Design a protein around this nucleic acid. Structure first.
Ligand SMILES: [K+]
Ligand SMILES: [K+]
Ligand SMILES: [K+]
Ligand SMILES: [K+]
Ligand SMILES: [K+]
Ligand SMILES: [K+]
Ligand SMILES: [K+]
Ligand SMILES: [K+]
Ligand SMILES: [K+]
Ligand SMILES: [K+]
Ligand SMILES: [K+]
Ligand SMILES: [K+]
Ligand SMILES: [K+]
Ligand SMILES: [K+]
Ligand SMILES: [K+]
Ligand SMILES: [K+]
Ligand SMILES: [K+]
Ligand SMILES: [K+]
Ligand SMILES: [K+]
Ligand SMILES: [K+]
Ligand SMILES: [K+]
Ligand SMILES: [K+]
Ligand SMILES: [K+]
Ligand SMILES: [K+]
Ligand SMILES: [K+]
Ligand SMILES: [K+]
Ligand SMILES: [K+]
Ligand SMILES: [K+]
Ligand SMILES: [K+]
Ligand SMILES: [K+]
Ligand SMILES: [K+]
Ligand SMILES: [K+]
Ligand SMILES: [K+]
Ligand SMILES: [K+]
Ligand SMILES: [Mg+2]
Ligand SMILES: [Mg+2]
Ligand SMILES: [Mg+2]
Ligand SMILES: [Mg+2]
Ligand SMILES: [Mg+2]
Ligand SMILES: [Mg+2]
Ligand SMILES: [Mg+2]
Ligand SMILES: [Mg+2]
Ligand SMILES: [Mg+2]
Ligand SMILES: [Mg+2]
Ligand SMILES: [Mg+2]
Ligand SMILES: [Mg+2]
Ligand SMILES: [Mg+2]
Ligand SMILES: [Mg+2]
Ligand SMILES: [Mg+2]
Ligand SMILES: [Mg+2]
Ligand SMILES: [Mg+2]
Ligand SMILES: [Mg+2]
Ligand SMILES: [Mg+2]
Ligand SMILES: [Mg+2]
Ligand SMILES: [Mg+2]
Ligand SMILES: [Mg+2]
Ligand SMILES: [Mg+2]
Ligand SMILES: [Mg+2]
Ligand SMILES: [Mg+2]
Ligand SMILES: [Mg+2]
Ligand SMILES: [Mg+2]
Ligand SMILES: [Mg+2]
Ligand SMILES: [Mg+2]
Ligand SMILES: [Mg+2]
Ligand SMILES: [Mg+2]
Ligand SMILES: [Mg+2]
Ligand SMILES: [Mg+2]
Ligand SMILES: [Mg+2]
Ligand SMILES: [Mg+2]
Ligand SMILES: [Mg+2]
Ligand SMILES: [Mg+2]
Ligand SMILES: [Mg+2]
Ligand SMILES: [Mg+2]
Ligand SMILES: [Mg+2]
Ligand SMILES: [Mg+2]
Ligand SMILES: [Mg+2]
Ligand SMILES: [Mg+2]
Ligand SMILES: [Mg+2]
Ligand SMILES: [Mg+2]
Lengths: 101, 61
RNA sequence: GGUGAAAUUUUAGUACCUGUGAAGAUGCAGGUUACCCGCGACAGGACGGAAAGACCCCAUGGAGCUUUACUGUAGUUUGAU
RNA sequence: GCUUCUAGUGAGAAAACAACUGCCCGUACCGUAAACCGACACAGGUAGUCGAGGAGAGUAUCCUAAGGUGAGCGAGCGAAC
RNA sequence: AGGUGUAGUGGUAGGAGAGCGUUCUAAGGGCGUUGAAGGUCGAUCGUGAGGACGGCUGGAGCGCUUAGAAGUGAGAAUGCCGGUAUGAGUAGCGAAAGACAGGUGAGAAUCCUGUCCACCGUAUGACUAAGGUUUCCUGGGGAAGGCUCGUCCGCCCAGGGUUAGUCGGGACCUAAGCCGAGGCCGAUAGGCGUAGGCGAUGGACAACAGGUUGAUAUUCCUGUACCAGUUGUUUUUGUUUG
RNA sequence: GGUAGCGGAGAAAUUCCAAACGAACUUGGAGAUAGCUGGUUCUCUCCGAAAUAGCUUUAGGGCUAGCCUCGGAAUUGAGAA
RNA sequence: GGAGCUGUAAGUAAGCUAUGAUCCAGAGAUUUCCGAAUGGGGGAACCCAAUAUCUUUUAUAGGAUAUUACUUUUCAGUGAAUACAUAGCUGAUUAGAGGUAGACGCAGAGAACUGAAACAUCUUAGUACCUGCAGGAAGAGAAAGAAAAUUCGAUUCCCUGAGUAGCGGCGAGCGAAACGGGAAGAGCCCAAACCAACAAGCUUGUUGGGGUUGUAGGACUCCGAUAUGGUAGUCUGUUAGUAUAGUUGAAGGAUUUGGAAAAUUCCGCUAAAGAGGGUGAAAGCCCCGUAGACGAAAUGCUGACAACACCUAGGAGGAUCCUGAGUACGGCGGAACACGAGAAAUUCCGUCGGAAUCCGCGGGGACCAUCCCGCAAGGCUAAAUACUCCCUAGUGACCGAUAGUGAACCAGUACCGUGAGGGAAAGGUGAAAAGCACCCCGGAAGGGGAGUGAAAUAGAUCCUGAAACCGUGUGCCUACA
């Protein structure tokens, strides 16, 4: 996927549009990703999971990878990714500014 | 098979035709005889058509 | 009290007599009788159900059988080669 | 299989005792059946063995022994048929 | 474009004409989360097939115009498939004895225990071949199955259970029959058949009694045996007129 | 264990050959053929029959003619009363 | 190839991965047992051996690996009646043995219903079925041809000829061919004469040479050139391309509505890319892509190039020799030819008889003469043609779950049948499980709240949710018909 675990991304569509977070996990086969503080769901858990009250747990649910744009670390703005060869290492380049990753 | 060892003659099918031209299937067989011939240096009894023996170039040892 | 089918079934608020009519009508005509809903019984009718009558006839249908029917033919036999 | 006979084969044989070796498959359970064949936990069908006592010719019959069973809807009522 | 006048306008088989609606294609022009199709309701319009417009439901698509192509229109075929009725709360619930006490449990005529009663007993007992193939045991379960019920079950769930030199089968034997090297025969395919085999329902063949587990036992264990063979020890006698 | 459908087997009944045997079952030829029965789906408008003759292995089938319908041509108007 | 991965399938558990995992493509290794099966047996997936070597145990028992079917081809060795032999026998060697793609090809064998308005000729058909053999294609093919415009110059297939000529209980029906126009094109090797060598009993075989045909050719005898051209040869390399993984690949933000925007409005931009798919509704500019550019360690496949191999002589002479025999052909009986015995040529099968041979032989639809055209009884041969179980990329005024494959779903399954064989039903929560914590009645099932959600009368028998059918409420009516 064009987005990777640990990337800083901005949500461009959804209820959490314009939120920004780190990718906690990527699901390449599903084209989905989890972003901190995005698409939180209230889950009604029975206490069979070592939580001796059960409670309603707040977790992040995956969002489609096309709803997220990687943030330009040098610029703080979301940008599309290009693949240019640097040092013979194929890397992602910010289409907007030319920064790497 | 019941086949002439030298010329390959064998049983085939023909038609009986009546005067009314009714057609029924018949067999038509060659005139095969058990003959002792010198096949590749050895005598042996093989089927041979009377036609193959007509010329006299086939052994009759 | 529990459990729970089936054949059948165009819709049916589904009487009697005489008559009528595809000539034997619960349903048409005339008249007569009959408050509404059931339960246990009986089978006269619904030409009741079941089976596209087996009898009968028909189809230039089928099948099995017979023979001095026709035409063939396995087999058998006789001659030529 | 076994027992004999020589032909062949033979350098070793046998006895006693001691120690030791011996593979694969089946081996549950039902089986006059609710567990098999009958579409059913179906009044049918299913080879062979054992199959007790009294009376008795008897494995008949009636009641019983060892043993097994009360059987997969019941409660009333005590009409017709 | 229409108007007037006269006349005509029942109809099966059937001929002719002109249309309605369905799906798709093309172009154009449009409508849709401010709610498409579909569903449902309404007192709406047209000469007919049929067409709108609203409310509700619904949640994504779909009209209109012109032309094109069609798996294009259903009420009947003892039509096919599905669903659901009627008969009905009706027939039936499959050959027979049960009763009560106590228990278990949310719940018991129906499960457990007890007692008496009753039934089979050349059997409804005890074995075993076949067949079945886990139905066996233990602990749970009560949706479905069980012709009622169910706390129970040959059902469901979770675990477990089948131990042999001697039993039966193979490493033994052959019968019927079958297969069949070469072989014989035959349009093909193949048919038959000798040697040689396969093949029991028969022949041959070494252990028994008791005990033991919830479930296996001539299989495990105890005691006491037997059959084939192996290694070693001692004892005898034979080494090629052996 | 043997005999298999143009067959087998039959103390013989058209008897049996996997719950229908004058000739099993299955698949295929195959959408056999069916002058027979049944079925054949929207609308309106115009017109509208026949159930006869002849021939027919023809008689509940068919063919030509007659009768219906649509289109067309044309004449000293040939039709009807 | 570059960050996750340990399939469907979650769950826990335990792990792997920048020393490059999972994944992707090429090439290898492993590949139990059954099955042609093939050491022997057998009721497939089991059982039981021999021989050799190794291993286990003190040893027997046990284990491992290898070899061992049948027939064929060739060689060797043994070796009967039986003298030499031969057969048999043992070993080695060599090659088949089965399956398919339910298709296409050739061949053997070969129906019936049916049509003829009956039915035996005929038709259905040389079809279905069975069997053999194949090959990627097969078959056919290099004139004993087609003709008679005068000529054409192997075969195959397409158009046409033509529903013509014909065949036919002259019924029903069956039904050409050549010419003409196209696709594609390609030609070659033997036998014999003769020569040489060898072996054998002057010929009589083996080998090599020679030779290949119809305006006749060749042998042979003369001279004369050892050139020039061609190829339907080979795991001969080299090279390029190509298939089988991939890399790169432009351009949008706000605003209104909404749970969500891609819808809307506003201004922008990109286009060799406005094919298509996905994304919380309908996106050229968010994602995968697309146009375009680019990429191969390995293994195939193809084309060249090179190598090597294999073919390729002109002219003049006829004295003699050769040019496919039990063949051609004929009688008889069948069959194939569109052609049903017919006036029936041409081709073939069975049976019997049976030629000529260059001054020859065959055909020109009985037959003869003349003329013309060809040269059988030997073989091979690419392309144009047929088909698609599979593979890759696509297409559709094709289907959209009673359709479309029987099968969208764990289907040739469940189920039925002794067996061959017959053969189903069954797709959809939501954008995301966020699949209803907790409470309440209940043994549970199931409900009621509370929550999640845009919506749960979307709660899993989950989108929509028609009708039959079943029920609850009640505006009006109903117990003399
Ligand atoms: K009537
Ligand atoms: K009655
Ligand atoms: K009959
Ligand atoms: K046991
Ligand atoms: K007594
Ligand atoms: K007794
Ligand atoms: K009971
Ligand atoms: K009573
Ligand atoms: K009575
Ligand atoms: K509406
Ligand atoms: K119907
Ligand atoms: K019913
Ligand atoms: K009812
Ligand atoms: K229980
Ligand atoms: K044993
Ligand atoms: K026995
Ligand atoms: K009998
Ligand atoms: K007319
Ligand atoms: K085998
Ligand atoms: K195929
Ligand atoms: K026929
Ligand atoms: K007919
Ligand atoms: K060929
Ligand atoms: K034609
Ligand atoms: K006829
Ligand atoms: K040559
Ligand atoms: K998106
Ligand atoms: K798009
Ligand atoms: K390559
Ligand atoms: K002829
Ligand atoms: K000719
Ligand atoms: K010629
Ligand atoms: K909904
Ligand atoms: K009502
Ligand atoms: Mg009357
Ligand atoms: Mg009357
Ligand atoms: Mg009335
Ligand atoms: Mg009236
Ligand atoms: Mg009746
Ligand atoms: Mg009748
Ligand atoms: Mg037991
Ligand atoms: Mg019983
Ligand atoms: Mg009128
Ligand atoms: Mg639609
Ligand atoms: Mg239709
Ligand atoms: Mg209907
Ligand atoms: Mg009743
Ligand atoms: Mg009972
Ligand atoms: Mg008693
Ligand atoms: Mg008795
Ligand atoms: Mg039990
Ligand atoms: Mg239990
Ligand atoms: Mg019950
Ligand atoms: Mg034994
Ligand atoms: Mg045999
Ligand atoms: Mg053989
Ligand atoms: Mg024998
Ligand atoms: Mg014994
Ligand atoms: Mg027991
Ligand atoms: Mg009789
Ligand atoms: Mg019977
Ligand atoms: Mg047919
Ligand atoms: Mg009229
Ligand atoms: Mg084997
Ligand atoms: Mg006929
Ligand atoms: Mg891009
Ligand atoms: Mg926009
Ligand atoms: Mg013919
Ligand atoms: Mg001739
Ligand atoms: Mg002849
Ligand atoms: Mg010439
Ligand atoms: Mg070819
Ligand atoms: Mg289907
Ligand atoms: Mg549907
Ligand atoms: Mg289906
Ligand atoms: Mg709703
Ligand atoms: Mg629903
Ligand atoms: Mg009154
Ligand atoms: Mg009143």
């Amino acid at each position: 996927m064009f987005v990777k675990k640990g990337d800083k991304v901005k949500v461009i569509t959804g209820k959490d549009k314009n939120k920004e977070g780190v990718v906690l996990a990527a699901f390449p086969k599903q084209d989905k990703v989890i972003v901190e503080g995005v698409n939180v769901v209230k889950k009604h858990q029975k206490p069979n999971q070592a939580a001796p009250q059960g409670g309603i747990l707040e977790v992040e649910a995956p969002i489609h990878v096309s709803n997220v744009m990687v943030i330009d670390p040098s610029n703080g703005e979301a940008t599309k990714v290009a693949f240019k060869e640097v040092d013979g290492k194929k890397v992602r380049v910010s289409k907007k500014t030319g920064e790497v990753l | 098979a019941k086949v002439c060892y030298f010329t390959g003659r064998k049983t085939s099918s023909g038609n009986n035709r009546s005067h009314a031209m009714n057609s029924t299937k018949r067999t038509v067989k060659p005139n095969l005889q058990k003959v002792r011939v010198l096949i590749d240096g050895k005598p042996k009894k093989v089927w041979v058509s009377t036609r193959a023996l007509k010329s006299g170039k086939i052994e009759r040892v």
